[PDB]
Amino acid sequence: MSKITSSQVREHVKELLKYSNETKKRNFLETVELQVGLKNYDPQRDKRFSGSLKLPNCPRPNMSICIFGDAFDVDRAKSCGVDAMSVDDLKKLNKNKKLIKKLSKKYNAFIASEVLIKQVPRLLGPQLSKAGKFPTPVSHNDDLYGKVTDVRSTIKFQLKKVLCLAVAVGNVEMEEDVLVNQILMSVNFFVSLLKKNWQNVGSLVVKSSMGPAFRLY
Amino acid sequence: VNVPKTRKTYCKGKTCRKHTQHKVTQYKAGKASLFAQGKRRYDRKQSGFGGQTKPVFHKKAKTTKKVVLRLECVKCKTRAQLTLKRCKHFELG
Amino acid sequence: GFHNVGNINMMAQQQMQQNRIKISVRNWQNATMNDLINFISRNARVAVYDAHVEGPLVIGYVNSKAEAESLMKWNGVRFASDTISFLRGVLLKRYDPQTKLLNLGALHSDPELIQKGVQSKMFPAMMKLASTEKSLIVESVNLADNQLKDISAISTLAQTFPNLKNLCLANNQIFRFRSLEVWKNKFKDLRELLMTNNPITTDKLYRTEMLRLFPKLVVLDNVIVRDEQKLQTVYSLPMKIQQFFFENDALGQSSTDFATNFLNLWDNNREQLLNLYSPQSQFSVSVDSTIPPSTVTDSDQTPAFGYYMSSSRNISKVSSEKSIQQRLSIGQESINSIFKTLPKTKHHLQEQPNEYSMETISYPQINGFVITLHGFFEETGKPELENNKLSKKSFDRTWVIVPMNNSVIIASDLLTVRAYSTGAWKT
RNA sequence: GAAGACAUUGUCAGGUGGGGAGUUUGGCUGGGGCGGCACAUCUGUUAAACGAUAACGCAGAUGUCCUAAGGGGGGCUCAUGGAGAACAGAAAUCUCCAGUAGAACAAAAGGGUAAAAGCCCCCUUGAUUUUGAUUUUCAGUGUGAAUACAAACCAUGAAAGUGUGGCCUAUCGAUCCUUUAGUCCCUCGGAAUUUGAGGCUAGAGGUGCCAGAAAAGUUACCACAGGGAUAACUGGCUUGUG
RNA sequence: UUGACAUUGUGAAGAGACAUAGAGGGUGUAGAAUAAGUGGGAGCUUCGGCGCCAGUGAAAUACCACUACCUUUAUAGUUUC
RNA sequence: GUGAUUUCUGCCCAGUGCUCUGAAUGUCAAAGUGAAGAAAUUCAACCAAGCGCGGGUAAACGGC
RNA sequence: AAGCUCGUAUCAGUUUUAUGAGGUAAAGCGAAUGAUUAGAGGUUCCGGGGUCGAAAUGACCUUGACCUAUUCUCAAACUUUAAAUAUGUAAGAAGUCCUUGUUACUUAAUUGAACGUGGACAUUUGAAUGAAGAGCUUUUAGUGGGCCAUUUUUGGUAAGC
Ligand SMILES: [Mg+2]
Ligand SMILES: [Mg+2]
Ligand SMILES: [Mg+2]
Ligand SMILES: [Mg+2]
Ligand SMILES: [Mg+2]
Ligand SMILES: [Mg+2]
Ligand SMILES: [Mg+2]
Ligand SMILES: [Mg+2]
Ligand SMILES: [Mg+2]
Ligand SMILES: [Mg+2]
Ligand SMILES: [Mg+2]
Ligand SMILES: [Mg+2]
Numbered sequence A: 001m002s003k004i005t006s007s008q009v010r011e012h013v014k015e016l017l018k019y020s021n022e023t024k025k026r027n028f029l030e031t032v033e034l035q036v037g038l039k040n041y042d043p044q045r046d047k048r049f050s051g052s053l054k055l056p057n058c059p060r061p062n063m064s065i066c067i068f069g070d071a072f073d074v075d076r077a078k079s080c081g082v083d084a085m086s087v088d089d090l091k092k093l094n095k096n097k098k099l100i101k102k103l104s105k106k107y108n109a110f111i112a113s114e115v116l117i118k119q120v121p122r123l124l125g126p127q128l129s130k131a132g133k134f135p136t137p138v139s140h141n142d143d144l145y146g147k148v149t150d151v152r153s154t155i156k157f158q159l160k161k162v163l164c165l166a167v168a169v170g171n172v173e174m175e176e177d178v179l180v181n182q183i184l185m186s187v188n189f190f191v192s193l194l195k196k197n198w199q200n201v202g203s204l205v206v207k208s209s210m211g212p213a214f215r216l217y
Numbered sequence B: 001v002n003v004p005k006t007r008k009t010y011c012k013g014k015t016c017r018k019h020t021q022h023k024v025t026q027y028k029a030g031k032a033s034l035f036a037q038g039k040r041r042y043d044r045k046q047s048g049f050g051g052q053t054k055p056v057f058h059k060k061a062k063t064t065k066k067v068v069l070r071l072e073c074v075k076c077k078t079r080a081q082l083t084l085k086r087c088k089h090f091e092l093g
Numbered sequence C: 001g002f003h004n005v006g007n008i009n010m011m012a013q014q015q016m017q018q019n020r021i022k023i024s025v026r027n028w029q030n031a032t033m034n035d036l037i038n039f040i041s042r043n044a045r046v047a048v049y050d051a052h053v054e055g056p057l058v059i060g061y062v063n064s065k066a067e068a069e070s071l072m073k074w075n076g077v078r079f080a081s082d083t084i085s086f087l088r089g090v091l092l093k094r095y096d097p098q099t100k101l102l103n104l105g106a107l108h109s110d111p112e113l114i115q116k117g118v119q120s121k122m123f124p125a126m127m128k129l130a131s132t133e134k135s136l137i138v139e140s141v142n143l144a145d146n147q148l149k150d151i152s153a154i155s156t157l158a159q160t161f162p163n164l165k166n167l168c169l170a171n172n173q174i175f176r177f178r179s180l181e182v183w184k185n186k187f188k189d190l191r192e193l194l195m196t197n198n199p200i201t202t203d204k205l206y207r208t209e210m211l212r213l214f215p216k217l218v219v220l221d222n223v224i225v226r227d228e229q230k231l232q233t234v235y236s237l238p239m240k241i242q243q244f245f246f247e248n249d250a251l252g253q254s255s256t257d258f259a260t261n262f263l264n265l266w267d268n269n270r271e272q273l274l275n276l277y278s279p280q281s282q283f284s285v286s287v288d289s290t291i292p293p294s295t296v297t298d299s300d301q302t303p304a305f306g307y308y309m310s311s312s313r314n315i316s317k318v319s320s321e322k323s324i325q326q327r328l329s330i331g332q333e334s335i336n337s338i339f340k341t342l343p344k345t346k347h348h349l350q351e352q353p354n355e356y357s358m359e360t361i362s363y364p365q366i367n368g369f370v371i372t373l374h375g376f377f378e379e380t381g382k383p384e385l386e387n388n389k390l391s392k393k394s395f396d397r398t399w400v401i402v403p404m405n406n407s408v409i410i411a412s413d414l415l416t417v418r419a420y421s422t423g424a425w426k427t
Numbered sequence D: 001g002a003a004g005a006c007a008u009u010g011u012c013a014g015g016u017g018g019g020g021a022g023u024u025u026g027g028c029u030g031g032g033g034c035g036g037c038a039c040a041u042c043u044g045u046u047a048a049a050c051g052a053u054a055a056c057g058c059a060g061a062u063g064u065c066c067u068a069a070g071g072g073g074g075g076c077u078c079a080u081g082g083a084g085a086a087c088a089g090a091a092a093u094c095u096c097c098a099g100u101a102g103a104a105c106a107a108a109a110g111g112g113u114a115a116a117a118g119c120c121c122c123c124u125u126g127a128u129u130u131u132g133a134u135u136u137u138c139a140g141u142g143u144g145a146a147u148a149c150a151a152a153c154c155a156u157g158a159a160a161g162u163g164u165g166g167c168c169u170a171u172c173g174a175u176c177c178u179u180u181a182g183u184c185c186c187u188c189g190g191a192a193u194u195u196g197a198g199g200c201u202a203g204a205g206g207u208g209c210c211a212g213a214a215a216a217g218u219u220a221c222c223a224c225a226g227g228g229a230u231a232a233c234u235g236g237c238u239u240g241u242g
Numbered sequence E: 001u002u003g004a005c006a007u008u009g010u011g012a013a014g015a016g017a018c019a020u021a022g023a024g025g026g027u028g029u030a031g032a033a034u035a036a037g038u039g040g041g042a043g044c045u046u047c048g049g050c051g052c053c054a055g056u057g058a059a060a061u062a063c064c065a066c067u068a069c070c071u072u073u074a075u076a077g078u079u080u081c
Numbered sequence F: 001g002u003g004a005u006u007u008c009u010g011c012c013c014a015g016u017g018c019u020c021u022g023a024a025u026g027u028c029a030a031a032g033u034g035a036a037g038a039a040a041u042u043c044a045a046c047c048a049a050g051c052g053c054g055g056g057u058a059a060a061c062g063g064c
Numbered sequence G: 001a002a003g004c005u006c007g008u009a010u011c012a013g014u015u016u017u018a019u020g021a022g023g024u025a026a027a028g029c030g031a032a033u034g035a036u037u038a039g040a041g042g043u044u045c046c047g048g049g050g051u052c053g054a055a056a057u058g059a060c061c062u063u064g065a066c067c068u069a070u071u072c073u074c075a076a077a078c079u080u081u082a083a084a085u086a087u088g089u090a091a092g093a094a095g096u097c098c099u100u101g102u103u104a105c106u107u108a109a110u111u112g113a114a115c116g117u118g119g120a121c122a123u124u125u126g127a128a129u130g131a132a133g134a135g136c137u138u139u140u141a142g143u144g145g146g147c148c149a150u151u152u153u154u155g156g157u158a159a160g161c
């Protein structure tokens, strides 16, 4: 929606950050996600819109991106200390059909080589895109550590058959004003992505991954 | 045709008066009903008995359109317009 | 480009999810697996449904239009590497260790291989299988009349079976020599070859080019084409070598004792070079830049000893006089300078006492005794004086010690950096 | 007796409505019509050695394409032939010699170009702002396209320089009406504030019949105002022999 | 021809849409199983209570996480027919 | 509409018409309803017949 | 038609002298371009498309790609040379020379560029012949169907086409 004097979200973020670790000092699982449900739009009758609105603020540090690439980016991935893959390894992955549906679950994402990604379309077969894990390409001269940071901090709004899109927009760690900036950026991106720029958005909720009863949005 | 969405050109704002950086979008249009003098005149001429009273054009010959770019200054927020030739496919990659 | 035409798509695995999750209680009386496969295919092979029987009288796994139509039709009508585990075992049975050779003839007349219904790339990969066997040792080969006018499938056998000694290939069907022309310096130690009743063996060149094809041949088709009694002493060494020898056995014992003592002391701390050498006992040190043949086993490619080159008193290395005069050894002070010039290295002689090879002798001009030992010297640590560090590198000490009642006193103190490889001690 | 706050009647609104009314039903053209566009444009020829010059003359093109295929700089030489090199066989990769362009430069044709205008790289946005003058068509009007300066701001290059889109010759559009950008802008006339509206300067939305109406047939039942049609004479042809 | 308003007064029953609250539905062949749902979700609870790693699955489960509607109720009202 | 008597008038409802013992929002005007606004207004839902979907009809026009 | 400002101008449907531009006639092709026409096969050297197809070891079609081992042959849309006829400019007083004034332009500069002050140069003041006065302004009529002849040409066997 058109923005609505975000002190209510400020008090909601303060109540959420006093819910996490000040009434339940649990183990380190900080992810203050924003769930947004849209109203007054038909999925089949309207266009299924999508975009990615990558904010550099990060909240999910433990991620799995099995870098699939060639030899030079394999050495670059071994330098960047992340789980890589080889060409014969990916050939065996396309050989065993049950291994792909499991490697899509043991990983959290993916990051491909601008020299082998125009094949993951067919070699690494379907259900990777159905699990929404189509790999993003990385060039022969871009920074692999920076690309891994971007693929860990890149959020994407996609219109499915349901109107209940939720995104890991923040962590419950700290930085109230930076969290307010993140909430403003996410609300701006959703409002600009929807067809009517204000009217369609109905439900906004904050939850710090703990089934907390503090939304107040 | 491909045009990038960033461009350094001259802006004539009173603060800048030099070459600055702009971002690029495409131009579109609107309309108005209980406002404009032409519509308010046409509706009264159209009411009553008499028929249609104005011409109606149905002999279109062009198949394409010129494209206009709107440039917004990042340091001034002063827009500017620039027209291009006739093309069939346009994007801002 | 790369792996492209793997065929993981085009109706094989993708777009196979058009199923319909309805009430699933279809008309189903008898549709089980064996009778279904029999009533579907009595003339060819077929591809079956996902999960379709009539055991529970319910079926909804006909995930396509023609699948659902055939299911409704039979509802409305009443009805009712992997070859390596045998190939390598056959090859290991063919490599009898008693005869020390394998026979690969007449495989196209053996029912264990005729009904298997498979030859050229099979034998060219069977060379790789026989090289990766490594425990079914076979020296010679017996593959007469192998149904080839050329030698394509037996081309890599010369590289894979480099201990060839004989071959019987008679009743051949070859009419050229260019297929055998690649066998120069390849299976050239073999000493018997005959492929008669053929246009490759009944030609003129069979006595002038066969010796070139096998220079080391002590026989030629149940004959002798070379002086095989003298070839063992002319084409090879006349006598063996001695990995440890001296003028006397007790001389070699004391020489090896003082050599191991000096090597252990130089490994622990060489700070007492001034106390090990006298005022006259000088030294020398040099490095070996160039290397031997590239096919030498575990051979250092280049002398990576770039922190010891300035104090190398080598004659033909540097062209100056004052440079070798400054890099050369005076008494105890410059002896300790040469001792701390190079990289300190614990002696790899106690691991391979065999490869630590030491000769010895006496010195009649001073009633002394000399010992030239040579071993490895692997340097974990280096010289603390200011590509940089060492590599796999050897060393050789040619000392000349004159004994007394107390101990022995050195006269020559040599240092030699080299390129490490295998030693001439082993068999 | 029957019916009953429903029908009926009044006003507005949506369908239906050749039963009826009014009107229209392009131009060029070996007659009209069909076909075509010779209706707005470009190259060679017709075209007769300045310029101009017709035909439903001839051979063809246009309503596009390009963030580089625009701008600056650096290095290099193209088509082709010959002699050589394992597999190599018209033809795969490498080496040398010859090579005035026989290649390439988006598209038709003509012109132009070799330490380049071609090919390969590097940096960029001058395809920017403000307005006058000039050339072609020409009434020396408009539209389109182009040329040379001025006043700013930039790019590139060591620099001199060059750069106001595409190496040159084609690639496109008024009034009225909508809409957009810009002016701590002007007006709403009894006086103010805020919406709304109207103006000024510069672009887009289009008229291809391209100086730019909003448009189907038939008449032998026909009407009006006018203009044109009739023996063979080649300024001299016709008879027996492909 | 169809709708609205007016002509136009006096009564009574029924069937429906909107908010507040309550739990129900996620059964195909499979996998114990009641998974065509959406991304968090690896550690929380004497309780191990399912997890990930086991496996079947297309989708796997703790913390019941958000939209829901689809079959369901109860309140008074607005209006309908 | 056909055109005394005699004799024969086959098959197609698909196209265009004409029609309706059929389903339910697909299109859906004024009036009324709701939301935002200082208000003029703007947005949204609901929505009659008709059309559309579905059925009938050839001594209807047609078609073979 | 009405005139107006002036009085032999510096002008010409022309020649001469000087100096440019052109690519037709003729030459020449054979010096590089030398052509339409009916022109035989060589399939994984190309293949344009058109029909089917729960799709690709994918079937069904025909113009043509390329003339392959064919040359003489000639041009209004081919070039090396190149007339005649027709065509642009100049032949001075608004000129030339000497000297030195202005400028915010230009030069390294006291250099130039443009415009000047002062001075010198008329029997010919810069080839011929002619000159019915020269220059300028306002306003308005009719016309906007043409035809014939020599020569040079385009399309139609060709015509008073
Ligand atoms: Mg009206
Ligand atoms: Mg009534
Ligand atoms: Mg009518
Ligand atoms: Mg009429
Ligand atoms: Mg006409
Ligand atoms: Mg005609
Ligand atoms: Mg001319
Ligand atoms: Mg260019
Ligand atoms: Mg003009
Ligand atoms: Mg316009
Ligand atoms: Mg016109
Ligand atoms: Mg016109």
Ligand SMILES: [Mg+2]
Pocket (backbone or CB within 6 Å): none
């Ligand atoms: Mg008449």
Ligand SMILES: [Mg+2]
Pocket (backbone or CB within 6 Å): F013
């Ligand atoms: Mg019908």
Ligand SMILES: [Mg+2]
Pocket (backbone or CB within 6 Å): none
């Ligand atoms: Mg309405």
Ligand SMILES: [Mg+2]
Pocket (backbone or CB within 6 Å): none
């Ligand atoms: Mg209706």
Ligand SMILES: [Mg+2]
Pocket (backbone or CB within 6 Å): none
């Ligand atoms: Mg001629």
Ligand SMILES: [Mg+2]
Pocket (backbone or CB within 6 Å): none
């Ligand atoms: Mg003077």
Ligand SMILES: [Mg+2]
Pocket (backbone or CB within 6 Å): none
């Ligand atoms: Mg006139």
Ligand SMILES: [Mg+2]
Pocket (backbone or CB within 6 Å): G145
């Ligand atoms: Mg007339």
